[PDB]
Design a protein around this ligand. Sequence first.
Ligand SMILES: [Cl-]
Ligand SMILES: [Cl-]
Lengths: 121, 121
Amino acid sequence: MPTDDIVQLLKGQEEAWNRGDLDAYMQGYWQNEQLMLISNGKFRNGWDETLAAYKKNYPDKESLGELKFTIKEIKMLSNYAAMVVGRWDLKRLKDTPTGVFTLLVEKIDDRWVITMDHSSD
Amino acid sequence: MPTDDIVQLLKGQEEAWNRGDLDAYMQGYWQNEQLMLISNGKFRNGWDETLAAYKKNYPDKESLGELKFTIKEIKMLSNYAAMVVGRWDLKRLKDTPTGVFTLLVEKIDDRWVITMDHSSD
Ligand SMILES: [Cl-]
Ligand SMILES: [Cl-]
């Protein structure tokens, strides 16, 4: 079932993040210059650029912190596209940042990948 | 063409907002308890609840300010669903708030309506 595959995609990302593997984490995202990440106030695009940004921001794997997603809803839009709405939580040394996310996931090459990710706090 | 209808939906909302007509503005959104609006950090649902919230926040039509959307991308996902990514701008008496939005629009009853709206700044 697609919802199960979509759930596993996000579970895999939590697990990769939580073992400090940015390369594995990035496998949840569409590997394309069109990949669109939206933050609180800005747009950025591209998978290479996004991977580079995480490496820049987290030179030490211990700095990633512990990630958990709480999925509020998965809505199938077609056999090839779904929207995923949830909260994210990070447990850090001196804080516990929280926020929300909304994702478009699409079936590309028989795999579900995140093609647009709007995360805010 | 659906992209033209989606563009017009957002143009109609600008126009309604800019003449102080919240009821007309709300016609851009799916009229359902499932309507999902995501802000920087929180979820809210429902069309009635959203209309009530705008009326609460903007008791005076002059307080709405001038709204403009700048659409960055419309992506058709199927004949029934599209994602819309853009910036919003408001011109107010003493400031000019800006931010980003990502929307799911869906063809429901042969009309394009916003069913999920994640707006942040
Ligand atoms: Cl389909
Ligand atoms: Cl279709």
